[PDB]
Nucleic acid binder design. Structure first.
Ligand code: SF4
Ligand SMILES: [Mg+2]
Ligand SMILES: [Zn+2]
Lengths: 381, 358, 160
DNA sequence: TCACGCAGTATCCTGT
RNA sequence: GGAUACUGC
């Protein structure tokens, strides 16, 4: 993909591929609340990194128009305000307030850098994507069981991670404090680059942590012991040794000198820890420190946060921010995600059904199913 | 159910929600009112003297309830006529006392307290069966989580609440609250969340019941105070209700004495002028008020003294509360910056505002 | 408060039987109480307006005088300044400062902006509605301060 | 270079 | 004692 080719393709996509009808269905939420779509904030990033916010639109036609006119490189969705953002200058000071917004989570592979060995920075590979695969299951289950949020849209971020939009009416009316509470409840791996032991579970395992460890276990052997090989050599297993009390460290080292496979080393570590009881949760702390999602509480706490819009185009990879089907999560491949160049090649190879002829169709289908569920909830209620 | 009974009084305990509709006699009215006043005064005295969980408290309260013939124990026999009578007593007397104890906030609080105490005692005497019956008749629908759902999430609840033992947990009942209200609990992950509801722990159930009761009762008292003009016109019931609370069933005066000996000459002069003219200019007011605060005159005592002294100066009684009450409160650090202003020091008095004529 | 009082006056000066009048008054007051407790009343109705005789700086009680405080804040902001004769509108809010109401004044915009300020319902029910109503009901038999407070949800204690 | 009078009600404060 | 408001005519 040639990023110099981005300015050539962006218009066509925004003209014949961007799913505006479903997009308006989403952000309009069945028209129940008046001025809901009209008070939504958008922000655009144009060529040469020119940023504009407090953009609002009257209806789908105005949005389609101004978007096709601007051809933005980035589209971010923001809060629904007390008035129309376009007229925020006209609103008396203090009377312009963000009132409702989806509850959103951003999981970014870059935040896992201190604990992955295959890639670094913005590089991803099939060996590390399983971490995202774990996160979506660990988090989404909580959101479906502990909090009872029923309408959850998971979206690929385009490069390094995934976003989650929780759109239940209750989740859209949550205050800042309630959002911060939700984020802290879901958050376990606490600390920066200056801390080595980032998980310190108490004697009692809270049911949520038990279910997160249960989800982790299913994948741990493949991710950590086979793929990541977190015990390949001394430079790496020294870390895991650094994560357990010194008392057994020596006892482990000799054992790790006689083990040929990291699965064997894990068995040995588990046996040694079991023999050594307050430390019976130490293996769980290691698993969490290598597998549990990291959440930027600043992303989810603030109501006025602008997050990458679904079906955006990644300025560098060119991939489309496509929704991820929860059931088919295990089959999701971030490298097969349609790029803008591929879908423009597909478009120029054959009115409201043009996208069905591209590789974008199944993802718009997943989005349509999610919107159908939202409509059913709006009606039934 | 002899002659004119019904299902109007199912259970002994009640929330006193529905006012009585009967036509009773004046003698019955007075007897019921006085009897419940005796019961509530006994409750208050026993609460002051003993710990409400003490066995002495229970024994004495049972003795009083038996002496005044109020419902306190259940009976797994049926609704016997005598029992019905007792319950009727309780129901009418309560509302009569409401009419007596809604005029002033103080009174209201007192009433509420006594009623709550009595209710707690009675709940403490309810067998589990009876307890459930009560919880059903009032649509409280506590199985508050059910027992079956509690067993359903037994392990989750056990791991949720810190330091909760298996059997002790079996002895406890939880409540279901929207998670938006348990922010401080959920945030550090010390309460289980299931389907958007937190299961918050509370022997404890009585507490919840009492909370509900108190809410209701406060509301009722407000309404009664709002419906007072209709009753004041009934002379028959005015002597009773207006005075039921007063029904048999350092001192300001010594300040003058102190002025003879202990008061320094400054305060002696100020007091002499005050008693001569029943009025002091601002400087005298400040100085004397601070001094009387220093000797120990409490805010109520100082307010009473100043009110009584100034009222004789041919000024409206309401004018005092309008003007000088704030100054008196401020001298005691009750308003404004709310500072416990110290009494003037001799250096301040000498170097304070220079007195002039008058 | 003004509106409440107006309603009360409309009830007092009518020809309805006095008892009914009182009943209606009670109802309205309770309604107001609820509307405050649930925070349904429009924010515009919580404002108090006061004029400045001097410039904001000349007042030596920048803390004790609420309107002056608000004026100072406005002059500290980056907009048109407020001078003698210019009316200022302020609201009384909660911030956790535990100070007197006179020191907790804030501009309406500020309340709409900051995430720590909320309207001090108590104050408005205790020192704005209750006084006015009481003074309007003083010569009317059957209504006294205590009762009014009760109807608003306030504690009726400190009111031969 | 300025700016009408007076009678009356309501609220709030007095540390260095 | 002082200070801040704004009604009446
Ligand atoms: S001010 Fe002090 S010195 Fe003077 S009369 Fe009073 S107590 Fe005595
Ligand atoms: Mg005076
Ligand atoms: Zn990788």
């Amino acid at each position: 993909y040639d990023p110099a080719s981005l300015p050539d393709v962006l218009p066509l996509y925004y003209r014949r591929l961007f799913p505006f009808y479903q997009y308006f269905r989403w952000l309009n939420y069945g028209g129940v609340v008046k001025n809901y779509f009209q008070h939504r904030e958008f922000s655009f990033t144009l060529k040469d990194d020119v940023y504009v916010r407090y953009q609002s639109f009257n209806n789908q036609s105005e949005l389609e128009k101004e978007m096709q006119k601007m051809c933005p490189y980035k589209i971010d969705i923001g809060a629904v305000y007390s008035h129309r953002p376009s007229l925020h200058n006209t609103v008396k000071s203090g009377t312009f307030q963000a009132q409702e917004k989806e509850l959103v989570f951003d999981i970014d592979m870059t935040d896992y850098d201190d604990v992955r060995r295959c890639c670094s920075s913005a590089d991803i590979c099939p060996k590390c994507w399983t971490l995202m695969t774990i996160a979506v299951r660990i988090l989404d289950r909580a959101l479906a069981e502990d909090f009872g949020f029923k309408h959850r849209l998971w979206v690929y971020s385009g490069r390094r991670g995934v976003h989650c939009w929780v759109c239940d009416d209750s989740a859209r009316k949550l205050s800042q404090a309630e959002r911060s509470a939700v984020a802290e409840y879901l958050s376990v791996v606490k600390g920066g680059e200056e801390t080595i032991k980032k998980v310190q579970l108490p004697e009692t395992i809270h049911p949520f942590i038990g279910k997160s460890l249960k989800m982790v276990e299913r994948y741990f052997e493949k991710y950590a012991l086979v793929d990541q090989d977190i015990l390949e050599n001394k430079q790496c297993w020294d870390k895991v040794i650094a994560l357990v009390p010194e008392v057994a460290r020596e006892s482990l080292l000799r054992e790790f000198s006689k083990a040929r496979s990291s699965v064997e080393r894990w068995d040995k570590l588990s046996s040694c820890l079991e023999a050594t009881r307050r430390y019976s949760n130490i293996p769980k702390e290691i698993m969490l420190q290598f597998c549990y999602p990291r959440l930027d509480v600043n992303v989810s706490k603030g109501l006025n946060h602008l997050l990458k819009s679904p079906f955006s185009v990644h300025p560098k990879t060119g991939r489309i921010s496509v929704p991820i089907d929860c059931k088919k999560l295990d089959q999701f491949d971030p490298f097969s995600v349609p790029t803008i160049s591929l879908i423009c090649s597909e478009l120029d190879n054959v009115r409201t059904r043009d996208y069905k002829r591209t590789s974008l169709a199944p993802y718009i289908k997943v989005f349509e199913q999610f919107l159908d569920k939202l409509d059913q909830s709006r009606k039934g209620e | 159910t002899g002659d004119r009974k019904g299902d109007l009084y199912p259970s002994s305990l009640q929330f006193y929600q529905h006012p009585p509709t009967e036509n009773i006699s004046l003698i019955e009215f007075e007897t019921f009112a006085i009897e419940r006043l005796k019961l509530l005064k006994a409750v208050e005295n026993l609460g002051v003297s003993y710990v409400k969980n003490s066995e002495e408290y229970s024994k004495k309260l049972e003795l009083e309830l038996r002496k005044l013939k109020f419902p306190y124990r259940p009976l797994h026999e049926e609704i016997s006529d005598d029992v019905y009578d007792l319950r009727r007593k309780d129901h009418i007397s309560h509302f009569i006392l409401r009419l007596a104890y809604c005029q002033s906030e103080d009174l209201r609080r007192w009433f509420i307290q006594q009623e709550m105490d009595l209710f707690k005692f009675r709940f403490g005497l309810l067998t589990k069966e009876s307890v459930q019956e009560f919880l059903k008749l009032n649509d409280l629908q506590y199985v508050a989580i059910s027992e079956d759902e509690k067993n359903m999430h037994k392990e989750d609840l056990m791991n949720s609440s810190f330091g909760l033992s298996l059997t002790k947990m079996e002895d406890t009942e939880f409540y279901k609250v929207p998670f938006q209200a348990a922010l401080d609990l959920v945030r550090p992950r010390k309460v289980f969340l299931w389907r958007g509801f937190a299961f918050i722990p509370h022997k404890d159930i009585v507490s919840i019941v009492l909370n509900d009761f108190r809410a209701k009762l406060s509301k009722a008292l407000a309404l009664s105070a709002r419906s007072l003009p209709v009753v004041q016109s009934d002379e028959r019931l005015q002597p009773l209700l207006n005075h039921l609370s007063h029904s048999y069933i350092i001192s300001l005066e010594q300040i003058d004495g102190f002025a003879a000996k202990s008061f320094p000459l400054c305060m002696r002069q100020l007091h002499k002028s005050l008693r001569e003219n029943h009025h002091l200019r601002h400087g005298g007011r400040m100085q004397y008020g601070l001094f009387l605060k220093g000797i120990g005159l409490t805010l109520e005592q100082a307010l009473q003294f100043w009110r009584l002294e100034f009222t004789k100066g041919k000024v409206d009684s309401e004018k005092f509360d309008k003007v000088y009450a704030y100054s008196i409160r401020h001298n005691y650090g009750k308003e404004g910056k709310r500072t416990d202003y110290t009494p003037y020091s001799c250096m301040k008095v000498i170097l304070s505002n220079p007195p002039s004529q008058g | 408060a003004k509106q409440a009082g107006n309603y009360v006056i409309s009830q007092i000066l009518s020809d309805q039987p006095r008892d009914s009048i009182v009943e209606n008054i009670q109802k309205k007051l309770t309604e107001i109480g609820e509307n405050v407790t649930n925070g349904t009343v429009p924010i515009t109705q919580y404002e108090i307006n006061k004029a400045l005789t001097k410039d904001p700086q000349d007042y030596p009680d920048k803390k004790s005088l609420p309107h002056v405080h608000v004026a100072l804040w406005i002059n500290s902001q980056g907009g048109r300044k407020v001078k003698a004769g210019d009316t200022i509108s302020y609201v009384i809010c909660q911030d956790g400062s535990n100070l007197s109401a006179s020191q907790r004044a804030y501009a309406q915009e500020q309340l709409q902006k900051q995430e720590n300020l909320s309207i001090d319902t108590q104050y408005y029910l205790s020192q704005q509605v209750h006084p006015v109503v009481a003074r309007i009901c003083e010569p009317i038999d059957g209504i006294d301060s205590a009762l009014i407070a009760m109807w608003l949800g306030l504690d009726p204690s400190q009111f031969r």
